[PDB]
Curated annotation (Swiss-Prot), chain A:
Biological source species: Homo sapiens (Human)
Residues of the full protein shown: 1930 to 2010 of 4967
Induction: By TGFB1.
Subcellular location: Sarcoplasmic reticulum membrane
Protein name listed in UniProt: Ryanodine receptor 2
Disease linked to the protein: Ventricular tachycardia, catecholaminergic polymorphic, 1, with or without atrial dysfunction and/or dilated cardiomyopathy: An arrhythmogenic disorder characterized by stress-induced, bidirectional ventricular tachycardia that may degenerate into cardiac arrest and cause sudden death. Patients present with recurrent syncope, seizures, or sudden death after physical activity or emotional stress. CPVT1 inheritance is autosomal dominant. Ventricular arrhythmias due to cardiac ryanodine receptor calcium release deficiency syndrome: An autosomal dominant arrhythmogenic disorder characterized by syncope, cardiac arrest and/or sudden unexpected death, often in association with physical exertion or acute emotional stress. Patients who survive manifest polymorphic ventricular tachycardia and ventricular fibrillation. Unlike typical catecholaminergic ventricular tachycardia, arrhythmias are not reproducible on exercise stress testing or adrenaline challenge.
Tissue: Detected in heart muscle (at protein level). Heart muscle, brain (cerebellum and hippocampus) and placenta.
Originating gene: RYR2
Protein backbone atom coordinates (compact mmCIF):
# COMPACT_ATOMS: atom_id res chain seq x y z
CA UNK A 1 0.00 0.00 0.00
CA UNK A 2 2.63 2.57 0.90
CA UNK A 3 5.13 1.35 -1.70
CA UNK A 4 2.60 1.89 -4.50
CA UNK A 5 1.56 5.26 -3.08
CA UNK A 6 5.16 6.48 -3.12
CA UNK A 7 5.65 5.09 -6.63
CA UNK A 8 2.48 6.84 -7.83
CA UNK A 9 3.62 10.15 -6.35
CA UNK A 10 6.95 9.67 -8.13
CA UNK A 11 5.07 9.11 -11.39
CA UNK A 12 3.11 12.30 -10.71
CA UNK A 13 6.38 14.22 -10.35
CA UNK A 14 8.14 12.61 -13.31
CA UNK A 15 5.25 13.11 -15.73
CA UNK A 16 5.11 16.79 -14.77
CA UNK A 17 8.86 17.07 -15.34
CA UNK A 18 8.47 15.48 -18.77
CA UNK A 19 5.61 17.84 -19.63
CA UNK A 20 7.76 20.81 -18.59
CA UNK A 21 10.69 19.41 -20.60
CA UNK A 22 8.85 18.31 -23.76
CA UNK A 23 9.82 21.53 -25.55
CA UNK A 24 13.49 20.67 -26.21
CA UNK A 25 12.77 17.84 -28.65
CA UNK A 26 9.81 15.89 -30.00
CA UNK A 27 11.98 12.81 -30.58
CA UNK A 28 13.07 12.85 -26.93
CA UNK A 29 9.44 13.08 -25.81
CA UNK A 30 8.76 9.73 -27.51
CA UNK A 31 11.17 7.73 -25.35
CA UNK A 32 10.11 9.79 -22.34
CA UNK A 33 6.45 8.95 -22.95
CA UNK A 34 7.00 5.24 -23.66
CA UNK A 35 6.38 4.69 -19.94
CA UNK A 36 3.30 6.89 -19.66
CA UNK A 37 1.73 5.33 -22.78
CA UNK A 38 2.60 1.73 -21.92
CA UNK A 39 -0.19 -0.44 -20.52
CA UNK A 40 -0.50 -0.29 -16.72
CA UNK A 41 0.97 -3.78 -16.33
CA UNK A 42 3.99 -2.85 -18.45
CA UNK A 43 4.49 0.41 -16.55
CA UNK A 44 4.86 -1.35 -13.22
CA UNK A 45 6.89 -4.12 -14.83
CA UNK A 46 9.43 -1.56 -16.01
CA UNK A 47 9.27 0.23 -12.65
CA UNK A 48 10.08 -3.06 -10.86
CA UNK A 49 13.36 -3.81 -12.69
CA UNK A 50 15.80 -2.41 -10.13
CA UNK A 51 16.73 -5.95 -9.17
CA UNK A 52 20.18 -6.97 -10.44
CA UNK A 53 22.57 -4.23 -11.59
CA UNK A 54 21.28 -3.37 -15.08
CA UNK A 55 19.23 -0.71 -13.27
CA UNK A 56 17.71 1.06 -16.27
CA UNK A 57 14.40 1.52 -14.45
CA UNK A 58 13.43 5.11 -13.55
CA UNK A 59 12.85 4.25 -9.89
CA UNK A 60 14.79 6.44 -7.44
CA UNK A 61 17.29 5.10 -4.94
CA UNK A 62 15.12 5.52 -1.84
CA UNK A 63 12.12 3.76 -3.39
CA UNK A 64 14.48 1.03 -4.56
CA UNK A 65 15.87 0.70 -1.03
CA UNK A 66 12.43 0.31 0.53
CA UNK A 67 11.67 -2.74 -1.59
CA UNK A 68 15.25 -4.06 -1.36
CA UNK A 69 14.82 -4.07 2.43
CA UNK A 70 11.32 -5.53 2.50
CA UNK A 71 12.43 -8.29 0.13
CA UNK A 72 15.36 -9.21 2.38
CA UNK A 73 12.98 -9.30 5.35
CA UNK A 74 10.61 -11.55 3.40
CA UNK A 75 13.46 -13.87 2.42
CA UNK A 76 14.76 -14.15 5.98
CA UNK A 77 11.20 -14.82 7.16
CA UNK A 78 10.87 -17.57 4.54
CA UNK A 79 14.22 -18.98 5.68
CA UNK A 80 15.93 -18.71 2.29
CA UNK A 81 18.68 -16.45 3.64
CA UNK B 1 0.10 14.92 -30.31
CA UNK B 2 -0.90 15.91 -26.77
CA UNK B 3 -3.92 13.59 -26.93
CA UNK B 4 -1.70 10.76 -28.18
CA UNK B 5 0.73 11.34 -25.31
CA UNK B 6 -2.24 11.38 -22.91
CA UNK B 7 -2.87 7.77 -21.81
CA UNK B 8 -3.72 5.80 -18.65
CA UNK B 9 -0.76 5.98 -16.24
CA UNK B 10 -0.49 4.38 -12.83
CA UNK B 11 -0.87 7.66 -10.95
CA UNK B 12 -4.44 8.08 -12.20
CA UNK B 13 -5.47 4.54 -11.26
CA UNK B 14 -7.17 3.78 -7.94
CA UNK B 15 -4.73 2.57 -5.33
CA UNK B 16 -6.14 -0.95 -4.91
CA UNK B 17 -5.90 -1.69 -8.64
CA UNK B 18 -2.27 -0.57 -8.64
CA UNK B 19 -1.68 -2.70 -5.54
CA UNK B 20 -2.98 -5.78 -7.35
CA UNK B 21 -0.77 -4.92 -10.33
CA UNK B 22 2.19 -4.56 -7.97
CA UNK B 23 1.44 -7.93 -6.39
CA UNK B 24 1.49 -9.66 -9.77
CA UNK B 25 4.56 -7.78 -10.99
CA UNK B 26 6.49 -8.32 -7.77
CA UNK B 27 5.62 -12.02 -7.91
CA UNK B 28 6.83 -12.56 -11.47
CA UNK B 29 9.86 -10.27 -11.30
CA UNK B 30 11.26 -11.17 -7.87
CA UNK B 31 9.76 -14.31 -6.32
CA UNK B 32 9.91 -16.36 -9.51
CA UNK B 33 13.45 -15.21 -10.29
CA UNK B 34 14.76 -15.83 -6.77
CA UNK B 35 17.00 -18.90 -6.78
CA UNK B 36 18.50 -20.89 -3.91
CA UNK B 37 20.34 -24.19 -4.29
CA UNK B 38 19.47 -26.96 -1.84
CA UNK B 39 19.12 -30.17 -3.87
CA UNK B 40 22.54 -31.65 -3.14
CA UNK B 41 22.27 -30.96 0.59
CA UNK B 42 18.73 -32.35 0.73
CA UNK B 43 19.67 -35.54 -1.10
CA UNK B 44 22.75 -36.01 1.08
CA UNK B 45 20.57 -35.66 4.18
CA UNK B 46 17.97 -38.06 2.79
CA UNK B 47 20.54 -40.71 1.85
CA UNK B 48 22.13 -40.87 5.30
CA UNK B 49 21.45 -44.01 7.35
CA UNK B 50 20.05 -42.18 10.34
CA UNK B 51 21.92 -43.83 13.23
CA UNK B 52 20.53 -47.24 12.33
CA UNK B 53 22.69 -49.28 14.78
CA UNK B 54 21.86 -46.81 17.57
CA UNK B 55 18.21 -47.40 16.68
CA UNK B 56 16.77 -50.78 17.67
CA UNK B 57 16.78 -52.25 14.18
CA UNK B 58 17.26 -55.82 15.47
CA UNK B 59 17.38 -57.19 11.95
CA UNK B 60 17.95 -56.18 8.35
CA UNK B 61 19.18 -52.64 7.73
CA UNK B 62 16.18 -50.35 7.38
CA UNK B 63 16.00 -48.54 4.06
CA UNK B 64 16.95 -44.88 4.12
CA UNK B 65 14.39 -42.11 3.50
CA UNK B 66 15.57 -41.63 -0.09
CA UNK B 67 15.11 -45.35 -0.66
Amino acid sequence: DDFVAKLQDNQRFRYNEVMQALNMSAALTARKTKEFRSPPQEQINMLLNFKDDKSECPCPEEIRDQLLDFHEDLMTHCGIE
Amino acid sequence: VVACFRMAPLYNLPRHRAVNLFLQGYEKSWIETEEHYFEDKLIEDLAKPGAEPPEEDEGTKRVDPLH
